[PDB]
Structure 1
């Protein structure tokens, strides 16, 4: 069981989830306040059609 623990503990990964979250953050919060109609995505276009 000591061998079991010694082998179970090192499950380390190459790129951590924190290294991803810091690479998937928001610096500029938003822009182009009127944008609800400049796109109107296809999921709503099917509804409109």
Structure 2
């Protein structure tokens, strides 16, 4: 136990976890501007273009092979991954929007 404790101690963060956030920390305040309405990120553009997407999307992947998606992602009934880990993965995919 002495050897294990002595060996488990010298685990050093290579740079830090506080250096990272101290260099992220921007002294510039919130300074809210019309940039919120000026940026319009990708998700907003996807959301507000519903009509065009609905009207102009036609083609389908005429040839498909079901159950290939699960195999490609490495999660299925039998694989090299643990059952609990894969279950957590599918749960996260279920709850991610």
TM normalised by structure 1 equals: 0.78
Q: Normalized per residue, which structure has more helix? A: 2
Q: Which runs of 5+ in 1 are unaligned?
A: none
Larger radius of gyration: 2
Q: Which runs of 5+ in 2 are unaligned?
A: 50-97
Alpha-carbon displacement from aligned partner over 1:10-48 (angstroms, at most 9, x marks no partner):
111220101111111021123461112212112111111
Tell me the number of residue pairs that the alignment of Structure 1 and Structure 2 aligns: 49
Question: Equivalents in 1 of 2:5, 2:44: separation in Å?
Answer: 53
TM normalised by structure 2 equals: 0.45
Root mean square deviation of aligned Cα: 1.5
